Amino acid sequence: QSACTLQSETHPPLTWQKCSSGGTCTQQTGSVVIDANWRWTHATNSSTNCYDGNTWSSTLCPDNETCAKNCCLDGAAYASTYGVTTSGNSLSIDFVTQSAQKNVGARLYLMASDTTYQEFTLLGNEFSFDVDVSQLPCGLNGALYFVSMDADGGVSKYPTNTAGAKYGTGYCDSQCPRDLKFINGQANVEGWEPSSNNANTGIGGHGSCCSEMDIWQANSISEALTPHPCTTVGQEICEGDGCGGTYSDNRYGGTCDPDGCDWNPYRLGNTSFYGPGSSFTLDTTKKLTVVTQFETSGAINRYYVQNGVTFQQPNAELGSYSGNELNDDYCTAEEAEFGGSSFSDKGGLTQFKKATSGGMVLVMSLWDDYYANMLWLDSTYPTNETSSTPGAVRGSCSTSSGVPAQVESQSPNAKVTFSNIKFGPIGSTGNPSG
Amino acid sequence: QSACTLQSETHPPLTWQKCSSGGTCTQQTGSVVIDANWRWTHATNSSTNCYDGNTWSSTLCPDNETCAKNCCLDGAAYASTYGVTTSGNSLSIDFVTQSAQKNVGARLYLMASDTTYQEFTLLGNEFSFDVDVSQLPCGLNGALYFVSMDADGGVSKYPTNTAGAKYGTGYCDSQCPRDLKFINGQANVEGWEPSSNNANTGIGGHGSCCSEMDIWQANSISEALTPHPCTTVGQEICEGDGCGGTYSDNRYGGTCDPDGCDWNPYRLGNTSFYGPGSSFTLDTTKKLTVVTQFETSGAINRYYVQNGVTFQQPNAELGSYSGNELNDDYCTAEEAEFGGSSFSDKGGLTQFKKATSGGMVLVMSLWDDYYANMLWLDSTYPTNETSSTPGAVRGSCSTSSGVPAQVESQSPNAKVTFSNIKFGPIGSTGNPSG
Ligand SMILES: O[C@@H]1[C@@H](O)[C@H](O[C@@H]2CO[C@@H](O[C@@H]3CO[C@@H](O)[C@H](O)[C@H]3O)[C@H](O)[C@H]2O)OC[C@H]1O
Ligand SMILES: O[C@@H]1[C@@H](O)[C@H](O[C@@H]2CO[C@@H](O[C@@H]3CO[C@@H](O)[C@H](O)[C@H]3O)[C@H](O)[C@H]2O)OC[C@H]1O
Ligand SMILES: *[C@@H]1O[C@H](CO)[C@@H](O)[C@H](O)[C@H]1NC(C)=O
Ligand SMILES: *[C@@H]1O[C@H](CO)[C@@H](O)[C@H](O)[C@H]1NC(C)=O
Ligand SMILES: [Co+2]
Ligand SMILES: [Co+2]
Ligand SMILES: [Co+2]
């Protein structure tokens, strides 16, 4: 797609700290950009929509190539349309924003310049952020994560994409998402099927795959840390059900691991660690600090700080595994006890290390779940299982929770705030901000 | 040996903090006891010495069993004889103390009660302490470490030892030391050879072996972190040169690894990390905090705090190894690049994990080195090597430094102070002391 300018594009600014092993941190200035799927897509020559509701213009978009030639992405009114605001080092995303139309959530990328994404090499480094999840009820996910996207959003590889990172192109993740309207500088109109339950979305014949580091998928009830390996590390198109992932018939018939090696302290048995109020170790009515460390072995370490008190990731015992480090032994034990082979089939932490050794783009989002109502995060899943099934219970939410239309109607003012992002060598980010 | 009471035994008290995963720490009250080798050893029935200078009484001690029956250990005047003092959570050890006789240094164990050693299970936990090394010049070693000693100092296994932990019996370490005067409730007079260079010491026909975790061996110039595995995890007697270690002909002909997998940041190439004054990352003229974490994988992590600034162990690159975690890959790369096979022959970190999974006793000591002048810690070693030999340079001290008689004469007022010991689950010890 190209870019149009009927609506101006001003990326909300966002600062973050780059820390050094020598003990100081220095401020960096970036900004955030909304993903292309949230944008108005119209004819290059007029205000006629190329996509409206969940269907494509059959005349503007008779095939993927013609569609991309005829159509452009336009600018975003971040606050009034999308409920996205920033202040200094803080970013807030509102759940439902009513303007001329209703918008639900957002997916945002941290930029290096007006036209390029910021890339982070996670291996050997740590990432710290503060989060307020107090306004996230059952069924919602305020997410902070990394994906192996191109810094230009795909322009160099696909010259029919001239919109680029400036307009939030080039997304990929470990679900090989097929809901994207543009992939590899082509539309995704071929094979398009409108969603049965979402007036705004559908599934196309192509998907976009890459490695994904889910540092944080969470609401006020549950939180999970999850690496997802793929056999191709970076962004790669996939065809139809061969994509695998959430948007396909066969979840496991592709190049990515859609399940990941997840660590949810509640799922692992510590039901007192994280939740609303003073009966939990971390009180989710209050802001908390989350630090994630990527040691060179490929294992992941985690600690939290709230009100000046520090907590390592809680210990878990699972089969022969015992500890609080997300390592090979943990992931292997998880598969053995909870089931599945996706993570290990895709190469486990060794394959994942190839992603963290390279550059990844920072994503912050707020979403509800039209496929599984977020039950995999905060409830019992599948819903017919009981607590006697190992790993079935992931949180205290009802198996009836998270219906998108219901949570959109009841909790429109839900929101997430991410702040005080700090990045640098392991051991460096607790030092004073500069 | 038995215990006598011509001199009373009052263990200087010492407090330390036990921390919990829930974020609080609670004070514990222990004390310290001096090792039996420093004590006066005399006839049970009189004040006649069983050992004097570096020779045994041929009449009281004609063989190991008769010697142990005839002889006892007596009490220690901690401050006036040994230069050992405590105040609250702080312990100081002076280098040379002049009383009726000259004493050099001390080796001390943390006690649980007046008659038993405190045991710590290191695996899954972390150990934090503060240290002032400013008064430790080249050739000195203020050491804090753990060994797999019996809590009773050997009494239950060897009933001819009735003196026990109260009198500091039962020592062992990875050098299988043969300088000990009593091992396994027998004297070590058989095969005794006086030291050629130390008026107070010798080498006997028996040694005492066990696993050793050297958290801290250091002076103002250099510091090292070193696990040492043994094929028998706990205390075990050894025979003659079959002992291996520093006190034997063949260093490597025994059950323990006398070399260990050492991590000295200077040895690994970072010559700016630790030293006297503001030109170093950690200024050794000032107190510093040292934290050591024993993850369940068997790897060891380390960070430091000085003046509120936190530093992870510096990154090192060695062969194919890159990182700051002391793990299997590091130890294997070290052997490949610096040479040696002792650590891996003895089972490496896997065998070492058997020690940290069990109980170990906390040792604090101050010593000079009558075998190698501490050159292996703070100089170039062996002394004929140059900086072009990988790992030869371990510190900036001259290869002429550390002659015991010289440093004892020039630096008698040298000292080390260890303080603010905190122990608990990984992530817990930075929380407020209680
Ligand atoms: O015509 C434009 C609309 O399409 C646009 O609607 C937004 C479309 O994206 C919606 O978010 C989806 C949430 O699920 C993700 O997986 C998808 O990638 C997203 O497409 C968003 O909720 C809608 O508001 O609004 C502007 C119109 O001009
Ligand atoms: O007779 C008693 C003396 O023997 C005692 O002298 C102390 C003996 O121990 C000395 O320290 C050695 C240092 O090296 C270690 O490897 C050895 O295990 C120790 O023996 C210490 O320096 C001497 O003061 O003093 C009291 C006398 O009654
Ligand atoms: C030494 O380590 C410190 C702390 O990690 C680091 O800041 C510094 O750059 C390192 N210097 C060298 C020469 O490796
Ligand atoms: C949960 O984790 C916290 C923090 O480590 C710990 O203090 C608590 O004992 C754990 N509770 C359970 C039930 O595992
Ligand atoms: Co195709
Ligand atoms: Co580790
Ligand atoms: Co014998």
From Swiss-Prot, chains A, B:
UniProt-recorded Gene Ontology molecular function terms: cellulose 1,4-beta-cellobiosidase activity; cellulose binding
Modified residues (Pyrrolidone carboxylic acid): 1
Keywords in alphabetical order: Carbohydrate metabolism, Cellulose degradation, Disulfide bond, Glycoprotein, Glycosidase, Hydrolase, Polysaccharide degradation, Pyrrolidone carboxylic acid, Secreted, Signal
Localization per Swiss-Prot or TrEMBL: Secreted
Ranges of compositional bias, category Polar residues: 384-420
Site (Not glycosylated): 64
Active site: 212 (nucleophile), 217 (proton donor/acceptor)
GO annotations of cellular component type: extracellular region
Region feature Disordered, mapped onto this chain: 384-434
Class of enzymatic activity (EC top level): hydrolase
Job description of the protein: Exocellobiohydrolases (CBH) that catalyzes the hydrolysis of 1,4-beta-D-glucosidic bonds in cellulose to release the disaccharide cellobiose. The degradation of cellulose involves an interplay between different cellulolytic enzymes. Hydrolysis starts with endoglucanases (EGs), which cut internal beta-1,4-glucosidic bonds in cellulose to reduce the polymerization degree of the substrate and create new chain ends for exocellobiohydrolases (CBHs). The CBHs release the disaccharide cellobiose from the non-reducing end of the cellulose polymer chain.
Name of the protein in question: Exoglucanase 1
Protein's organism: Hypocrea jecorina
Residues represented out of the complete protein: 18 to 451 of 513
